[PDB]
Amino acid sequence: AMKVTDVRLRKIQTDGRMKALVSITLDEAFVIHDLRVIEGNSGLFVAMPSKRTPDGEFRDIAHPINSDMRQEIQDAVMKVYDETD
Amino acid sequence: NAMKVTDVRLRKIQTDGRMKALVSITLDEAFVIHDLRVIEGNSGLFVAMPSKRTPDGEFRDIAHPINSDMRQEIQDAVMKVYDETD
Incomplete structure (x- = not known):
């Protein structure tokens, strides 16, 4: 099964929601950039890089198919x- | 070595311009990357990576292969x- 083989991140100091910008590497072969660690009062999570769509809303530019893999990345x-640090 | 592109969703665009198609790929039936672009370069067509405009007029490539096998597999x-x- 596909593995996250590297994680590179830079923490951000603020009281804003975005806590870090993150790049991950999958199977030592492919890198995805512009993931973020986000903190809300409902807990910490990792978001995929995303775009505003012809709406309206934001959609992931890159994402796992299976929610289990989303948790694995997180x-x-x-x-x-x-x-x- | 490379993961496999197990699915390709492609929409051709008709224009004189250099972007000829918008593409989404799936890797090993498990991970999806959207907004790849088939581009007419000086030496022929090639596949460019998802590229997000910044609020200051520049672009960031969001995903790239980091080895030769992976690069060739996407192309x-x-x-x-x-x-x-067609």
């Missing part, structure tokens, strides 16, 4: 976020 | 479909 990213 | 899988498309 766990891998948050692991590194916690390790980061 | 090959997408252009294969482009060339099958």
Whole structure:
């Protein structure tokens, strides 16, 4: 199964919602940039890079098909976020 | 070595301009990347990566292959479909 093989992030100091900008590498072969760690009072999460669509709303530019893989990415990213000064 | 492009969704665009198609790909039946673009370059058609405009007029490429096998697989899988498309 596909693995997150690298996580690179830069923490941001603010009281805004966006806490870090993140790049992940999948199977040592493909890099996705502009993920973010977001903090709200409902908890921490990792968002995919996204765009405003011809609406209206924002949609992920790149994303897992299966929600289990979304959690996998989040766990891998948050692991590194916690390790980061 | 590379993951496989297991699905390609492609829409041709008709124009004199250099963007000839908008493309979404799926890797190993598990991960989707949208807004790849088939581009007419000086030396022929190629596949460019999702590129997000910044609020200051520049662009950021959101996803790229980081090895040769992965790079060639994207170009090959997408252009294969482009060339099958009327």
